[PDB]
C-alpha cells in the first residue's frame, strides 16, 4: 500500500466513523477495555469541564482489573484536567 | 576512519555483576519468570568501551594518557528503539566527532553507536581531554551531524532569501516553495588552521520537502564549501530562520524531586572487572601518585551509573525503558568512601518527555557531577468528555492566561462571526436568553446563505424528505432569532462548539507546555471524539471543527418532531443494573430492552455502554422509557432473576413470562398524556434536558447530509495516518483505528455504507 492511497483510505474510513458515530451506540466499555488492557495505560488523563470519564475508569478498574493490576504490578493514575491540573502541568505549591 | 568494535552477546551473569557493582536495584534487571531481563542503558559503555576508548589512541591524537581526563559521558536512546535485553547480540562502532586543540589542551569527542539486528539502538557520546600544549592543527577536525532543521516557507520574501543562498541547490530550479515545509539533514565537516579560524568548512546534505502525505522526499541539497572562515553560515542561517522539530519548554519553577545520598565503594575493583576499564589510577596507589591524583579515584563512569540509578528510581518511577537520554559532566575527582548528595530537579519538557537536571556534591559541598536526563512520561491515553456540565464562563479562566487557549478561542470566534454572525465567546461568557442574527450588508448576505445551505433528512410517513434547518430563513429574511428559556449555552448547537473549544483549548495549552507524549493513545465519549481528533491528529482546523459540531448540534436539535413549546416524545434514562439486582447482568438488561422494543413496538435502545453492570444510557420513545422504568422497578420488588430462570428453570418461558410484565407496564404508560415526565425509578434516572435519542438507529436517516458536510470540512490532505493508526479508538467500533480490510469490514457490519462496501470489494486494487 502506497502512502498516497493509504491516506485517501483513512480519509474515507474516518469520515464514515464520524458520520455514523451519532447513529450507532457509544461502546465506551469496550473502549475502556482497549486502553486499560490492550495498551496497559498508566495515566488516563481526562480533558473536560467535569471528571465523568475519570469517574467511569475508576469504577471500571475497581470492578474487573484489581487482579490484572496486581499480576503485572503497574500503577494506574486517573487524572482530570479540571480537578488535577497541578498533577498534569507539574505546578506544585512551595 | 570509523572504528569497529566486536559483537557483544549480553548474558544474565554480566547484567547481575554490572548492577551489583553500581548498586542499581531496579526490578527490570532482576530475572523473573515470564518476562525477558533488560540490561541497564549504563551497560552500553561496557559494550562500547573497547571501541570508544580506541579513538584516543592513534599517533595523530598524541597525548600523555596518564593525564587523560574524562570530561563528559552521554547516552541517547534512538526514538522507537526498545532497551537492551539479555540474548541481544549488540555490534558497536565509534567515530571521532571532533578533535580540537583548546589553549589548555586537546578535546576528543567520540560517538559510539550500539546496533542490534542491523538497526541502531543508542549513541554513546564521550568527551576526553588530553592536558597540555598542542599546536598540531593539521590533525584537528570536527565532523558534526547537525540537528534536523525545519522551515515553513510562508511568504515570497522567505523564497527570495533562500534563493539568495548559493548553497541552497534545488534539483529543479522552478520548484514551488510556497506553503512548503523544508527539512535540512546536514553534516558539517570543519578542518582548522589556528584555534580561532577554520581552514576549510563544508556543510552538505539533503533538502527534503513534506508531501501532503507527511512522507518527506529529497528535492535539493545543501552544498556549501568554504576555505578560511570564522564560522558556518548554513547552520547559523537555519538556527535563526528555522526550528529543530522539538523545543525544550521550561517549567515556571524547577520542582525539586529529591536530595538523595550515595556512597562510592571502598575499592574500585568490582566496577573495573565488570566495565573493563582497568585504568591503573582507579586501583593502584603508585600510578595514582604518578598521575598527581589525590588517591585511587572512583571511576567517573561508576558515579554516572550510580546517579542514573537514582534518576531511574525517583524520576522514571523504577521503569528503565522511560529513561531515553542521560548526560553527565564529570566536574571533580571522587575518592572511595565518599558520601555524595544528589539534588535532582524537574526543569522542563521536550515533546512529552521530562527534562531532569541533577547536581551531585561531596561532604565539602563541592559540585562533582552535573547532568541532564530525558524521561518518557508513563504510557498515556487522553479521554475527552462528551456533553455534560455547560457552566457559563467555562474555559474562560484558561482563556485569560494561556496564549494557545487564546489562539483557539479567537480563531473560533472570528470564524463564527464571519460565517454565522455570532460570537461563541459572548455566548460562553454572558449566556444570553435570546440572540438575534442580522443579515444586512455584503457580510449579512453571505451569513444568510450559510444558514440557508444547512439541510437535514428525516422520515415523513416512511419517506426520506430533505427539509431545511432554519425553514423560516429565506432569500428575503433580514434577521433570525435563537430562543431559549434560561440561556442559549444550554441549547445543543451552542453547548457542543463551546465544549469542543474548551477541550481543544485545554489541550493546545498542555501541548504548548510540552506535556503531550508523541505516541499517546486517545478516545472521546460521543462529542468528545471531535475535540480528540482535532487535538491529537489535527485532522480539522479549529474553523472546520467548530462548523462541524455546530451543524451536529443543529442536526440533533431538529432530528425529531416537536410540539409548540418544543418538547418531543423521546428521552434518555441512566440505568444501573447493579442497583435493581446484583444478579441482573448486562445481557439481562439488553434482553429486557430488545423485548420491550419488539413487543410494545415503540423505539428503545442502549446508546451508551459506560461501566460494565453499573452505567448504561437507554434512549428512545419517551413512553418505552416509562415501560422499561416500571419493568425494572417491578423486577426489583419480586426479586426474580431472568438469567437463572432462562437457563436452569425453563427454555423460552422468560420470553412469554416477561411479555405479561411488559403489557402490565405498557398499558399504564400509554394512558398518561404524550408529553409524559419520566419518574426517577429505583434503577432508572432520567437524563434531564435531552429530548433527542442520538446514538440510536433513529438518527440513521439524518447521516447522509451530516456526512456530506463532513466531506467538505475534512480534506484527505490533512488526514495523517501515522497520527491515527493504532492511537485513535472510535466510539463506533471500539477498536484502535487501522487501515486494514478486517477493520473496514467491521465498520461495514455496523453501518452498511456503500463507500466502505466498494473499498471491501476492491481491496486488492488499492493494495497495488
Swiss-Prot record, chain A:
Disulfide bonds: none
Description of post-translational modifications: 4'-phosphopantetheine is transferred from CoA to a specific serine of the Acyl carrier domain by the C-terminal PPT domain. This modification is essential for activity because fatty acids are bound in thioester linkage to the sulfhydryl of the prosthetic group.
Transmembrane segments: none
Covalent cross-link site, Glycyl lysine isopeptide (Lys-Gly) (interchain with G-Cter in ubiquitin): 37
Residue(s) carrying Phosphoserine: 50
Additional notes on this entry: Present with 17000 molecules/cell in log phase SD medium.
Family designation: Belongs to the thiolase-like superfamily. Fungal fatty acid synthetase subunit alpha family.
Described function: Fatty acid synthetase catalyzes the formation of long-chain fatty acids from acetyl-CoA, malonyl-CoA and NADPH. The alpha subunit contains domains for: acyl carrier protein, 3-oxoacyl-[acyl-carrier-protein] reductase, and 3-oxoacyl-[acyl-carrier-protein] synthase. This subunit coordinates the binding of the six beta subunits to the enzyme complex.
Subunit structure as annotated in this protein's UniProt entry: [Alpha(6)beta(6)] hexamers of two multifunctional subunits (alpha and beta).
Record's protein name: Fatty acid synthase subunit alpha
Organism expressing this protein natively: Saccharomyces cerevisiae (strain ATCC 204508 / S288c) (Baker's yeast)
Covered residues, full protein: 1 to 94 of 1887
Swiss-Prot record, chain B:
The protein's name: Fatty acid synthase subunit beta
GO molecular function: (3R)-hydroxyacyl-[acyl-carrier-protein] dehydratase activity; [acyl-carrier-protein] S-acetyltransferase activity; [acyl-carrier-protein] S-malonyltransferase activity; enoyl-[acyl-carrier-protein] reductase (NADH) activity; enoyl-[acyl-carrier-protein] reductase (NADPH) activity; fatty acid synthase activity; fatty acyl-[ACP] hydrolase activity; fatty-acyl-CoA synthase activity
Family classification: Belongs to the fungal fatty acid synthetase subunit beta family.
MaoC-like domain: residues covered: 241-366
Quaternary state and interactors: [Alpha(6)beta(6)] hexamers of two multifunctional subunits (alpha and beta).
Active-site residues per Swiss-Prot or TrEMBL entry: 526
Keywords, comma-separated and alphabetical: Acetylation, Fatty acid biosynthesis, Fatty acid metabolism, Hydrolase, Isopeptide bond, Lipid biosynthesis, Lipid metabolism, Lyase, Multifunctional enzyme, NAD, NADP, Oxidoreductase, Phosphoprotein, Transferase, Ubl conjugation
Region Dehydratase, residue ranges: 1-344
Purpose: Fatty acid synthetase catalyzes the formation of long-chain fatty acids from acetyl-CoA, malonyl-CoA and NADPH. The beta subunit contains domains for: [acyl-carrier-protein] acetyltransferase and malonyltransferase, S-acyl fatty acid synthase thioesterase, enoyl-[acyl-carrier-protein] reductase, and 3-hydroxypalmitoyl-[acyl-carrier-protein] dehydratase.
Lineage start: Eukaryota, Fungi, Dikarya, Ascomycota, Saccharomycotina
Residue ranges, annotated region (Malonyl/palmitoyl transferase): 345-563
Crosslinked positions (Glycyl lysine isopeptide (Lys-Gly) (interchain with G-Cter in ubiquitin)): 82
Keyword Oxidoreductase: yes
UniProt GO BP: long-chain fatty acid biosynthetic process
Miscellaneous remark of the record: Present with 91800 molecules/cell in log phase SD medium.
Keyword Ubl conjugation found: yes
GO cellular component, as recorded: cytoplasm; cytosol; fatty acid synthase complex; lipid droplet; mitochondrion
Amino acid at each position: 500500500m502506497k502512502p498516497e492511497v493509504e491516506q485517501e483510505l483513512a480519509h474515507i474510513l474516518l469520515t464514515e466513523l464520524l458520520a455514523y458515530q451519532f447513529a450507532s451506540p457509544v461502546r465506551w466499555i469496550e473502549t475502556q477495555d482497549v486502553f486499560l488492557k490492550d495498551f496497559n495505560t498508566e495515566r488516563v488523563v481526562e480533558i473536560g469541564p467535569s471528571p465523568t470519564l475519570a469517574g467511569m475508569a475508576q469504577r471500571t478498574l475497581k470492578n474487573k482489573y484489581e487482579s490484572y493490576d496486581a499480576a503485572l504490578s503497574l500503577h494506574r493514575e486517573i487524572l482530570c484536567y479540571s480537578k488535577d491540573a497541578k498533577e498534569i502541568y507539574y505546578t506544585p505549591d512551595p | 576512519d570509523v572504528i569497529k568494535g566486536k559483537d557483544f552477546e549480553i548474558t544474565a551473569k554480566e547484567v547481575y555483576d554490572f548492577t551489583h557493582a553500581v548498586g542499581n536495584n531496579c526490578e527490570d534487571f532482576v530475572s523473573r519468570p515470564d518476562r525477558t531481563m533488560l540490561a541497564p542503558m549504563d551497560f552500553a559503555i561496557v559494550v562500547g568501551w573497547r571501541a570508544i576508548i580506541k579513538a584516543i589512541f592513534p599517533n595523530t591524537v598524541d597525548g600523555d594518557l596518564l593525564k587523560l581526563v574524562h570530561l563528559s559521558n552521554g547516552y541517547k536512546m534512538i526514538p522507537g528503539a526498545k532497551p537492551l535485553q539479555v540474548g541481544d547480540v549488540v555490534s558497536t562502532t565509534a567515530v571521532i566527532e571532533s578533535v580540537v586543540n583548546q589553549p589548555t589542551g586537546k578535546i576528543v569527542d567520540v560517538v559510539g553507536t550500539l546496533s542490534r539486528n542491523g538497526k541502531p539502538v543508542m549513541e554513546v557520546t564521550s568527551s576526553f581531554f588530553y592536558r597540555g600544549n598542542y599546536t598540531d592543527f593539521e590533525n584537528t577536525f570536527q565532523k558534526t551531524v547537525e540537528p534536523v532543521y525545519q522551515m515553513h516557507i510562508k511568504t515570497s520574501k522567505d523564497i527570495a532569501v533562500l534563493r539568495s543562498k548559493e548553497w541552497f541547490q534545488l534539483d529543479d530550479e522552478d520548484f514551488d516553495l510556497l506553503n512548503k515545509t523544508l527539512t535540512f539533514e546536514t553534516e558539517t565537516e570543519v578542518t582548522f588552521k589556528n584555534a580561532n579560524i577554520f581552514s576549510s568548512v563544508k556543510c552538505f546534505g539533503p533538502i527534503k520537502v513534506e508531501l501532503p502525505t507527511k512522507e518527506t522526499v529529497e528535492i535539493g541539497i545543501v552544498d556549501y564549501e568554504a576555505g578560511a572562515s570564522h564560522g558556518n553560515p548554513v547552520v547559523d542561517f537555519l538556527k535563526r530562520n528555522g526550528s529543530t522539530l522539538e523545543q525544550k519548554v521550561n517549567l515556571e519553577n524547577p520542582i525539586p524531586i529529591a536530595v538523595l545520598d550515595s556512597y562510592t565503594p571502598s575499592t574500585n575493583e568490582p566496577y573495573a572487572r565488570v566495565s573493563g576499564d582497568l585504568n591503573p589510577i582507579h586501583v593502584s596507589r603508585h600510578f595514582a601518585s604518578y598521575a598527581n591524583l589525590p588517591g585511587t579515584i572512583t571511576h567517573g563512569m561508576f558515579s554516572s551509573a550510580s546517579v542514573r540509578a537514582l534518576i531511574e528510581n525517583w524520576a522514571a518511577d523504577s521503569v528503565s525503558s522511560r529513561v531515553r537520554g542521560y548526560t553527565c559532566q564529570f566536574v571533580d575527582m571522587v575518592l572511595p568512601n565518599t558520601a555524595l548528595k544528589t539534588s535532582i530537579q524537574h526543569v522542563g519538557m521536550i515533546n512529552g518527555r521530562k527534562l531532569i537536571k541533577f547536581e551531585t556534591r561531596n561532604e565539602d559541598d563541592v559540585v562533582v557531577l552535573t547532568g541532564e536526563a530525558e524521561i518518557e512520561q508513563p504510557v498515556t491515553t487522553f479521554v475527552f468528555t462528551g456533553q455534560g456540565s455547560q457552566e457559563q464562563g467555562m474555559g474562560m479562566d484558561l482563556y485569560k492566561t494561556s496564549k494557545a487557549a487564546q489562539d483557539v478561542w479567537n480563531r473560533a470566534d472570528n470564524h463564527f462571526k464571519d460565517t454565522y454572525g455570532f460570537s461563541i465567546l459572548d455566548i460562553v461568557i454572558n449566556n444570553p436568553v435570546n440572540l438575534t442574527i442580522h443579515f444586512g450588508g455584503e457580510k449579512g448576505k453571505r451569513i444568510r446563505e450559510n444558514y440557508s445551505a444547512m439541510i437535514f433528512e428525516t422520515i415523513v410517513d416512511g419517506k426520506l424528505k430533505t427539509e431545511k434547518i432554519f425553514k423560516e430563513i429565506n432569500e428575503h429574511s433580514t434577521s433570525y432569532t435563537f430562543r431559549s428559556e434560561k440561556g442559549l449555552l444550554s441549547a445543543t448547537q451552542f453547548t457542543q462548539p463551546a465544549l469542543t473549544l474548551m477541550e481543544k483549548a485545554a489541550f493546545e495549552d498542555l501541548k504548548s507546555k510540552g506535556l503531550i507524549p508523541a505516541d499517546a493513545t486517545f478516545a472521546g465519549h460521543s462529542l468528545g471524539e471531535y475535540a480528540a481528533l482535532a487535538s491529537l491528529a489535527d485532522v480539522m482546523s479549529i474553523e472546520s471543527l467548530v462548523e462541524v459540531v455546530f451543524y451536529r448540534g443543529m442536526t440533533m436539535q431538529v432530528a425529531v418532531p416537536r410540539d409548540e413549546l418544543g418538547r418531543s416524545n423521546y428521552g434518555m434514562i441512566a440505568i444501573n443494573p447493579g442497583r435493581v439486582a446484583a444478579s441482573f447482568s448486562q445481557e439481562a438488561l439488553q434482553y429486557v430492552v430488545e423485548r420491550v422494543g419488539k413487543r410494545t413496538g415503540w423505539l428503545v435502545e442502549i446508546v451508551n455502554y459506560n461501566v460494565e453492570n453499573q452505567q448504561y444510557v437507554a434512549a428512545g420513545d419517551l413512553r418505552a422509557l416509562d415501560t422499561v422504568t416500571n419493568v425494572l422497578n417491578f423486577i426489583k420488588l419480586q426479586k426474580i432473576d431472568i438469567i437463572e430462570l432462562q437457563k436452569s428453570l425453563s427454555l423460552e418461558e422468560v420470553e412469554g413470562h416477561l411479555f405479561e410484565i411488559i403489557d402490565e407496564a405498557s398499558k399504564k404508560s400509554a394512558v398518561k398524556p404524550r408529553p409524559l415526565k419520566l419518574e426517577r425509578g429505583f434503577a432508572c434516572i432520567p437524563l434531564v434536558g435531552i429530548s433527542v435519542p442520538f446514538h440510536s438507529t433513529y438518527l440513521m436517516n439524518g447521516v447522509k447530509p451530516f456526512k456530506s458536510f463532513l466531506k467538505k470540512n475534512i480534506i484527505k490532505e490533512n488526514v495523517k495516518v501515522a497520527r491515527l493508526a493504532g492511537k485513535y479508538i472510535p466510539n463506533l467500533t471500539a477498536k484502535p483505528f487501522q487501515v486494514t480490510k478486517e477493520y473496514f469490514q467491521d465498520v461495514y457490519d455496523l453501518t452498511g455504507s456503500e463507500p466502505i462496501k466498494e473499498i471491501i470489494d476492491n481491496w486488492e486494487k488499492y493494495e497495488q
